[PDB]
Enzyme design. Structure first.
Site, PDB file in Angstrom:
ATOM      1  N   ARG A 256       0.807  -1.476   0.645  1.00 11.19           N
ATOM      2  CA  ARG A 256       0.053  -0.475  -0.384  1.00 11.19           C
ATOM      3  C   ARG A 256       1.392   0.545   0.286  1.00 11.19           C
ATOM      4  O   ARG A 256       0.349   2.243   0.122  1.00 11.19           O
ATOM      5  CB  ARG A 256      -1.117  -0.150   1.179  1.00 11.19           C
ATOM      6  CG  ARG A 256      -1.819  -1.493   0.934  1.00 11.19           C
ATOM      7  CD  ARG A 256      -3.039  -0.522   1.952  1.00 11.19           C
ATOM      8  NE  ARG A 256      -3.856  -0.947   2.285  1.00 11.19           N
ATOM      9  CZ  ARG A 256      -4.237  -2.628   2.111  1.00 11.19           C
ATOM     10  NH1 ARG A 256      -4.203  -3.659   1.364  1.00 11.19           N
ATOM     11  NH2 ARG A 256      -4.840  -3.640   2.947  1.00 11.19           N
TER      12      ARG A 256
HETATM   13  N1  ATP Z   1      -6.808   2.613  -8.783  1.00  8.69           N
HETATM   14  C1  ATP Z   1      -5.937   1.737  -8.289  1.00  8.69           C
HETATM   15  N2  ATP Z   1      -4.855   1.204  -9.368  1.00  8.69           N
HETATM   16  C2  ATP Z   1      -4.356   0.640  -9.306  1.00  8.69           C
HETATM   17  N3  ATP Z   1      -3.604  -0.607  -8.612  1.00  8.69           N
HETATM   18  C3  ATP Z   1      -4.443   0.016  -7.265  1.00  8.69           C
HETATM   19  C4  ATP Z   1      -6.186   1.064  -7.127  1.00  8.69           C
HETATM   20  N4  ATP Z   1      -6.661   0.546  -6.270  1.00  8.69           N
HETATM   21  C5  ATP Z   1      -6.241  -0.775  -5.301  1.00  8.69           C
HETATM   22  N5  ATP Z   1      -4.615  -0.214  -5.720  1.00  8.69           N
HETATM   23  C6  ATP Z   1      -4.041  -1.045  -5.487  1.00  8.69           C
HETATM   24  O1  ATP Z   1      -4.090  -1.813  -4.167  1.00  8.69           O
HETATM   25  C7  ATP Z   1      -4.135  -1.935  -3.349  1.00  8.69           C
HETATM   26  C8  ATP Z   1      -6.100  -1.125  -2.131  1.00  8.69           C
HETATM   27  O2  ATP Z   1      -4.939  -0.665  -1.257  1.00  8.69           O
HETATM   28  P1  ATP Z   1      -6.716   0.402  -0.920  1.00  8.69           P
HETATM   29  O3  ATP Z   1      -6.766   1.021  -0.645  1.00  8.69           O
HETATM   30  O4  ATP Z   1      -7.785  -0.128  -1.981  1.00  8.69           O
HETATM   31  O5  ATP Z   1      -7.059  -1.023   0.392  1.00  8.69           O
HETATM   32  P2  ATP Z   1      -8.814  -1.099   0.759  1.00  8.69           P
HETATM   33  O6  ATP Z   1      -9.975  -0.904   0.087  1.00  8.69           O
HETATM   34  O7  ATP Z   1      -8.933   0.834   1.074  1.00  8.69           O
HETATM   35  O8  ATP Z   1      -8.592  -1.602   2.598  1.00  8.69           O
HETATM   36  P3  ATP Z   1      -8.915  -1.450   3.517  1.00  8.69           P
HETATM   37  O9  ATP Z   1     -11.051  -2.057   3.352  1.00  8.69           O
HETATM   38  O10 ATP Z   1      -8.505  -2.385   5.128  1.00  8.69           O
HETATM   39  O11 ATP Z   1      -9.660  -0.362   3.363  1.00  8.69           O
HETATM   40  C9  ATP Z   1      -3.184  -0.335  -3.653  1.00  8.69           C
HETATM   41  O12 ATP Z   1      -2.495   0.154  -2.423  1.00  8.69           O
HETATM   42  C10 ATP Z   1      -2.743  -0.727  -4.433  1.00  8.69           C
HETATM   43  O13 ATP Z   1      -1.496  -1.791  -4.757  1.00  8.69           O
END
Ligand code: ATP
Ligand code: ATP
Ligand code: ATP
Ligand code: MG
Ligand code: MG
Ligand code: MG
Lengths: 476, 56, 471, 470
Positions: free
Chosen positions: A340
């Site tokens: 992340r």
């Molecule tokens: N739009 C995107 N483009 C590229 N990579 C992405 C994108 N969205 C997510 N990722 C990848 O997947 C990861 C998902 O991180 P994210 O913060 O979205 O998790 P999350 O769904 O917020 O988790 P939580 O539910 O614990 O908050 C990113 O850190 C990156 O590695």
């Protein structure tokens, strides 16, 4: 007054009557000399958890209040010693000779006391450094099934941290003691112990000390952190901490939950994992960083304790048994493993060389599934199927063999720009070793520039060096 | 060509008969695993519920 | 008065009120000896072990024999110590119960011989010794894929009727003849018929003179079965430390130690967990298995049989014991019903001795390449279940042919199988097991048929077995 | 009239008020103790009444750690619920659950107005329900589940799927244009993302129009539940009294539901379903029914909802689906294939996809895409076992187009500048309809499929192919 008397004794939990001025979280001392922590306070009964052998505590024996909240000993003298969760030496070798103490129930650095991760933690494993990069102040999860590479990725990391002014802690929770002595002899042989601390909580100990062991380990590292030096911490199993508290809470008769775990699992793990941070320049710019481990039955990502911990961390490295038995070691699934903070935790050269490889190794994995069902294919797919096979071989690496970062960027540069395409798939591991030899004898200037600048040299010169080696090579 | 085309059509027909028979056998074997899993999930949830209820 | 009274009875469990200020320690032993004073009453001898201090001068004690006939108001005496087991040379050649009494009808052990406690603390970090050398059993699959280690823990997992005890008897036969050292055989939860059969095997062999046996069997009350494993190990701990001899400890069913604890726990006033198990499973197992370790003074090797409740490896008791074992073989039902003996899972079984330096690079490259062919065929199996092998192309065809050869060439003829099948047995030395797999992997024996690769020891035997068929 | 602690049971505390003048449910209590001797620890604590038990005794949930609490201490009764600063003083600042400013910027005056966190919800006499379309610039949302201006928007997903990387993209696009206050309520989120957002808002300059309430993963459960209500009272004051339109961003509203469970057993409640509180629907309703757009003014509300164990059939998500106007569900299978954003184009729905609310041309194209992707789902089973060449020309042409449609739903964001190198794109709605119509009519089928991954407009896809050499 400050004296009470034990009324129930069983299974490492006791109940006392009296001790009116006790606090929640205090230390209490029995007559035998075994110590204890107060976790509940009903109107007539004080609830105490024993931190030692309970086979000498009888009903009606006295218990007396220390006056201190739970405290772990800290100082520079702990480095290079094998210790208990309580500050007690285990390796033999006499006392630890500490100077001061810290609470094990510290508050975490608040928002406005932290900064962004901007400096690398170079592990020396090609897949981890290139695809799922780690920087100082990150929390990173190694998740997997039994016998897949978890302890080995953690120890290889400690060994490849010698030059940097790093301090490392290894907390062994629930492990058989023979294995920990094996790990310690392994560190001593690679010379690692001189800058490390080992904390041991063997499977024979009361579950309360298993429960206290991770907290003791971070309590020891935060001392260095607020003083400015960088620190790394490894927890061998957090799934065994979850078991240990399940048992304790069931003895103190707290109702069950999802499975039989209490609801305070999320609180327990967050309390521990949110003390990991990068402090700002006002705080002196130190860093903790943390590596939890978690074992999953059936090698399954979708389950209660795994998904709880995958919510608290700043990334994951998921290791798969079928990859491991199929010749890919370290066995990392690039589709399910994400960072992340990835992108800021790399040197400028590696950002440019290897910015989208993780997405690219996921497209290859999915297209391969489709073509095992597609018969004939077109030119653009056969080309991308080739680059994917060549990449999975460049990512392979044997145990106890570190690769420096400057060499990682050069082999990944050959892969991304097409120089490895002619080499058959079988020779890619051999071409790598011969390339490192050639680079050391002849190409000192390119590596000098990388160590000097943290940036890539002029393309013409790189193309010249790599093309010249491709002339020297001999192929099957 | 007469013999070749006739023999090709017959070969697909038995291959299809055996393929269908293997698939239908797998459906009964899988169906029983689903029913054993469904009955265990309904005996776990009721024991966790009753375990908390007995404590309180 | 250090005497007590019984206040309650609940199957295995009993509750004993004592005088104020004079209560037993938490693993201490008690005695009931009662003579009938009327026709209605019955006579008793019984012993009990303390487990909890419950308040009101009361104590909760599990029982080591059946509690049928107890009256409230009976008088209970205190031994002052844990269950004390006779130890020394006098143990060799004898059969024992949990109480330490000889059940062999050869006499009774002289009362002046030293007896040591059952519950003692585990060995310290300074003392333990770590080394690796390889122990050779002559069984193909163990010797290549998951080699056993001298001074280690060896665990054999499997469900009901899948072949654990026959593999143990083959290990006893080869190793205890070559060992030159003491052995202890301990039976927790095993048939009381297999005890007698083994005793006659040991007397006929002459191997009895250098071994000692503790038995507690399926018929005994739950309490006795728990303490029997601990009883066997206090004798073994004397042979490793004070005599200084190297030792083998064989345990007949270690699952029954957890199972027995489950029955008594609910009745002690404890809440349940997981699939109805106890709330102290990890600590109870670990307290026993940390004692079974190699030390500077000498070495113990333990070979243990672990039952799996159903053919389900997710259960709480098997899963925790996986974390304690150095070398493990898992026996699978599917393979046994196909006719593969012994039924070891080639990909699930593991060992710490599979490392280039320990085994040599030739053995290491052969073992890993065999495990890669077997994993590809565990994925091809999903498509060949329906369509057959017409869908497969190229590498898929060659991989399935070599996987069939490998899977049948891991099966062996045992000397202990002679009581079931008329064939003679075979011992395959390690240097021979590696050579055969390499010729199979190269493809040097592609022509020979699959039915010639079953129940044989060396590659030469496959060629003569093929020549008998002529296929 | 003061009180005394009797039982300290981890997060819960119990207090006996001897006089008989008991507090009331939802009131707030103060524990201020200075240490008499060296053994003790100084304590400053707030607690909220949950339940009246029998012996003049009240159960209370704490808003700080109960470490160092000793039986017999003193509790002072404020006589009111937790009270929060509301006004122009809130703008540009970060606050704790109690309205104390966390930031080093300064201290709020005691002359300021404060409002109470608890209040009955708006009524059928004065709610309203007009529809408009809110542009986001994200291809999937703008076509298949348009967000409705003034209505509730929900992002559902399991761990590590893409939820917080969407909220940050919406904050770049919607925040600056949509003139009016923005509130951010981070319930149960990491403190590495709170710090990153503060500096992101300071850089752009959105701070002057913003107020933030942060409660991170490490607080006691009670603080995590009452952090949603603190953000809401601020947004309510801006909606009703000032009358400006407002945006609310709430991060992980599941962490509100999860906290109740932890405290349920120690409060004395019997368990229900999968270890959940016997009062799940009732609490979700009270909180959610306040988040509405009235005749006075509009709240657009955007939420991340956590799917507890990758199981959408769990009680907490099922109960949540009943409250939204538009919903996108995020799926890990797509995230494994690398198609970001990983949005289910079938399970995602909105009340604005109606022929008159979006236009006939838009609706035609949207439903036609949804037929193509449902046909590809059933056909994948047949391909996996029997093989793709076995099938008809119409079945082949479906698989051809469905691969391209599914990859062209992926997009290059500005917040994915860190994750993917490439800078990022904003696609206006008219363009999205043109392009998806071309894919369906087959004009661009000559191009190779890898060209459709992480691109914004269809023009770009033509060039990306040129580099490959087609
Ligand atoms: N739009 C995107 N483009 C590229 N990579 C992405 C994108 N969205 C997510 N990722 C990848 O997947 C990861 C998902 O991180 P994210 O913060 O979205 O998790 P999350 O769904 O917020 O988790 P939580 O539910 O614990 O908050 C990113 O850190 C990156 O590695
Ligand atoms: N890069 C590698 N190449 C080859 N073998 C490897 C590599 N990394 C690990 N191994 C081997 O894989 C196994 C990993 O053992 P290790 O104890 O590290 O795993 P683990 O998951 O921690 O095991 P456990 O579940 O018992 O803790 C060992 O056989 C080790 O030598
Ligand atoms: N190597 C072998 N060759 C042939 N038959 C065998 C072999 N091993 C076991 N069997 C057969 O399979 C069964 C094995 O019996 P065994 O007592 O070893 O099983 P077990 O798993 O120990 O049983 P339990 O689980 O009840 O303790 C018997 O029917 C035996 O004849
Ligand atoms: Mg390990
Ligand atoms: Mg048997
Ligand atoms: Mg998030």
């Amino acid at each position: 007054s400050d004296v009470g008397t034990v009324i129930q004794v069983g299974d490492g939990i006791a109940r006392a009557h009296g001790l009116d001025n006790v606090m929640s979280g205090e230390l209490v001392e029995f007559a035998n000399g075994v110590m204890g922590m107060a976790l509940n306070l009903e109107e007539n009964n004080v609830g105490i958890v024993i931190l030692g052998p309970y086979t000498g505590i009888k009903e009606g024996d006295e218990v007396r209040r220390t006056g201190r909240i739970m405290e772990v000993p800290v100082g520079e003298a702990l480095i290079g010693r094998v210790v208990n969760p309580l500050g007690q030496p285990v390796d033999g070798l006499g006392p630890v000779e500490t100077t001061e103490t810290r609470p094990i129930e510290s508050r975490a650095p608040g928002v406005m006391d932290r900064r962004s991760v901007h400096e690398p933690l170079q592990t020396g494993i090609k897949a981890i450094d290139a695809l799922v990069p780690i920087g100082r102040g990150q929390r990173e999860l190694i998740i997997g099934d039994r016998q897949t590479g978890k302890t080995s990725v953690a120890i290889d990391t400690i060994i490849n941290q010698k030059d940097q002014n790093m301090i490392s802690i290894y907390v062994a929770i629930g492990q058989k003691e023979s294995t920990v002595r094996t790990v310690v002899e392994t560190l001593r042989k690679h010379g690692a112990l001189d800058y490390t601390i080992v904390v041991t909580a063997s499977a024979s100990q009361p579950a309360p000390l298993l429960f206290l062991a991770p907290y003791a380990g971070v309590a020891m590292g935060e001392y260095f952190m607020y003083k400015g030096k960088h620190v790394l911490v490894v927890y061998d199993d957090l799934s065994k901490q979850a078991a240990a508290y399940r048992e304790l809470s069931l003895l103190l008769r707290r109702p069950p939950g999802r499975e039989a775990y209490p609801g305070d699992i999320f609180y327990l793990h967050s309390r521990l994992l949110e003390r990991a941070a990068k402090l700002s320049d006002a705080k002196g710019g130190g860093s903790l960083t943390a590596l939890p481990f978690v074992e999953t039955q059936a090698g399954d990502i979708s389950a209660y304790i795994p998904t709880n911990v995958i919510s608290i961390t700043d990334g994951q490295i998921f290791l798969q048994s079928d990859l491991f038995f199929s010749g890919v070691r370290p066995a990392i699934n690039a589709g399910l493993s994400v960072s992340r903070v990835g992108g800021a935790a790399q040197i400028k050269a590696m950002k440019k060389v290897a910015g989208t490889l993780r997405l690219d190794l996921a497209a290859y994995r999915e297209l391969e599934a489709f073509a095992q069902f597609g018969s004939d294919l077109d030119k653009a797919t056969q080309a991308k199927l080739a680059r994917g096979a060549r990449t999975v071989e460049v990512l392979k690496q044997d145990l106890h063999q570190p690769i420096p970062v400057e060499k990682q960027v050069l082999i990944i540069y050959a892969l991304t720009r097409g120089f490895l395409d002619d080499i058959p798939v079988e020779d890619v591991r051999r071409f790598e070793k011969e390339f490192y030899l050639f680079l050391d004898q002849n190409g000192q200037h390119l590596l000098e520039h990388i160590r000097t600048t943290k940036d890539l040299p002029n393309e013409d010169d790189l193309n010249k060096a790599i093309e010249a080696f491709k002339k020297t090579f001999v192929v099957s | 060509l007469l013999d070749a085309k006739a023999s090709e059509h017959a070969a697909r027909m038995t291959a299809m008969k055996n393929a269908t028979d293997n698939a239908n056998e797998l459906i009964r074997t899988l169906t029983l695993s689903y029913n054993r899993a469904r009955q265990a999930a309904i005996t776990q949830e009721i024991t966790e519920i009753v375990a908390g209820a007995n404590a309180l | 008065m250090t005497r007590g009274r019984v206040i309650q009875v609940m199957g295995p469990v009993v509750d004993v009120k004592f005088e104020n200020g004079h209560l037993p320690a938490i693993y201490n032993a008690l005695k009931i000896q009662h003579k009938a004073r009327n026709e209605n009453e019955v006579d008793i001898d019984l012993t009990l072990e303390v487990a909890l201090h419950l308040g009101d001068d009361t104590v909760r004690t599990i029982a080591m024999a059946s509690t049928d006939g107890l009256i409230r108001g009976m008088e209970v005496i205190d031994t002052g110590a844990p269950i004390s087991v006779p130890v020394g040379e006098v143990t060799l050649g004898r059969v024992f119960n949990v109480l330490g009494e000889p059940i062999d009808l050869e006499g009774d052990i002289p009362a002046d011989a030293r007896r040591d406690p059952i519950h003692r603390p585990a060995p310290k970090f300074e003392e333990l010794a770590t080394e690796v050398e390889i122990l050779e059993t002559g069984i193909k699959v163990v010797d290549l894929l998951a080699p056993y280690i001298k001074g280690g823990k060896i665990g054999l997992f499997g469900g009901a009727g899948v072949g654990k005890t026959v593999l143990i008897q083959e290990l006893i036969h080869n190793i205890a003849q070559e060992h030159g050292g003491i052995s202890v055989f301990a039976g927790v939860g095993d048939r009381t018929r297999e005890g007698n059969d083994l005793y006659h095997e040991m007397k006929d062999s002459g191997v009895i003179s250098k071994t000692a046996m503790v038995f507690g069997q399926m018929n005994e009350p739950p309490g006795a079965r728990m303490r029997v494993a601990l009883t066997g190990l206090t004798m073994a701990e004397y042979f490793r430390d004070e005599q200084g001899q190297d030792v083998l400890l064989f345990i007949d069913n270690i699952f029954r130690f957890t199972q027995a604890g489950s029955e008594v726990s609910a009745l002690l006033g404890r809440m349940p967990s997981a699939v109805g198990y106890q709330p102290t499973l990890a600590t109870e197992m670990g307290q026993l298995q940390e004692r079974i370790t190699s030390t500077a003074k000498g070495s113990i090797t333990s070979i243990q049989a672990i039952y799996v409740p159903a053919d389900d490896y997710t259960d709480p008791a098997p899963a925790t014991t996986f974390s304690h074992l150095d070398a493990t073989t898992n026996l699978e039902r599917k393979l046994a019903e196909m006719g593969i003996y012994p039924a070891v899972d080639p990909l699930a079984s593991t060992s710490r001795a599979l490392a280039p330096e320990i085994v040599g690079e030739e053995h290491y490259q052969v073992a890993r390449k065999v495990q890669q062919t077997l994993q590809r065929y565990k994925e091809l199996q999903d498509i060949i279940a329906i369509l057959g092998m017409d869908e497969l192309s190229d590498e898929d065809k060659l991989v399935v042919h070599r996987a069939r050869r490998i899977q049948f060439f891991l099966s062996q003829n045992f000397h202990v199988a002679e009581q079931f099948t008329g064939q003679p047995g075979s011992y395959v030395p390690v240097k021979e097991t590696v050579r055969g797999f390499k010729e199979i992997l190269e493809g040097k024996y592609d022509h020979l048929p699959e039915d010639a690769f079953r129940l044989v020891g060396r590659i030469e035997e496959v060629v003569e077995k093929a020549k008998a068929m002529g296929v």
